[PDB]
Design a protein around this ligand. Structure first.
Ligand SMILES: [Cl-]
Ligand SMILES: [Cl-]
Lengths: 8, 149, 149, 8
């Protein structure tokens, strides 16, 4: 998701 | 004073952020929970005391002071559970200003994280590494190491 | 070496216990998750690095070494993400014995706790306070304070 | 429930 805790 | 911590509970996004502050250093640990309960507070203190040498905790309110589950965790971990009455009135101000700062930081990181719990740990990290001089993470280790020696 | 940590993942009760070990002291932190994912491992390392000055992490397996989410957390927190190949063969042995010790403690406390996560934090606490004469918790603070000075 | 984490 392009977040540090969820790069998907 | 190397072993004294204060609990602090603040709200954001409909959730509760529980904070433990090491009073002499200003180092913090924190977690997000849906609501402040004795059971969640007790688990958080059990975590904290396995990580640092917690002698006394000033609880954040009278319900956590009363809670049999919190008293059981403090017994288990060897912590003296105390009230958190600001007999020093500078305490209210310091906690309030810390909660403002933490919320400001969370806002600054919030879009880097899918979950609020991520953003709160990013804020813990920035708070504990900030040099004010030494950081709070440096001050807490120096203080405890000086006690151990 | 004040800054080096190793990840370790062990299983109990159908659940996964993720452990970070501070190599020079044997101090640990741990949590219980339903399964080891890059997202859960990344969150756990962000928590660890806000609490201690984590310079390097030896990851526990090649999935967490490859994981873009783990790499993103190590970037965010300023950690050097490394493999955990036991170039020193004594490592496999020390981790296996640590996992056995921890599971032994967990069984000894398990009936004091409703949730496995409680028993695992009880075990972290007993491991880190064990005198073996300093404890791992004393040794980690002494090491890091000596580095800061 | 008479546990450290849940004294109910
Ligand atoms: Cl609440
Ligand atoms: Cl797994």
């Amino acid at each position: 998701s392009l977040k540090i805790d969820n790069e998907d | 004073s190397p072993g004294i911590w204060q609990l602090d509970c603040t709200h954001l996004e409909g959730k509760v952020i529980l904070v433990a502050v090491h009073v002499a250093s200003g180092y913090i640990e924190a977690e997000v929970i849906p609501a402040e309960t004795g059971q969640e507070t007790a688990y958080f203190l059990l975590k904290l005391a396995g990580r640092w040498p917690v002698k006394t905790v000033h609880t954040d309110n009278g319900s956590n002071f009363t809670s049999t589950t919190v008293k059981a965790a403090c017994w288990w971990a060897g912590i003296k559970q105390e009230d958190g009455i600001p007999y020093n009135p500078q305490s209210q101000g310091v906690i309030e200003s810390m909660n403002k700062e933490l919320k400001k930081i969370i806002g600054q990181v919030r879009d880097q994280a899918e979950h609020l719990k991520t953003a709160v740990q990013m804020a813990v990290f920035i708070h504990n590494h900030k040099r004010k001089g030494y950081s709070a993470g440096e001050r807490i280790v120096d203080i405890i190491a000086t006690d151990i020696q």
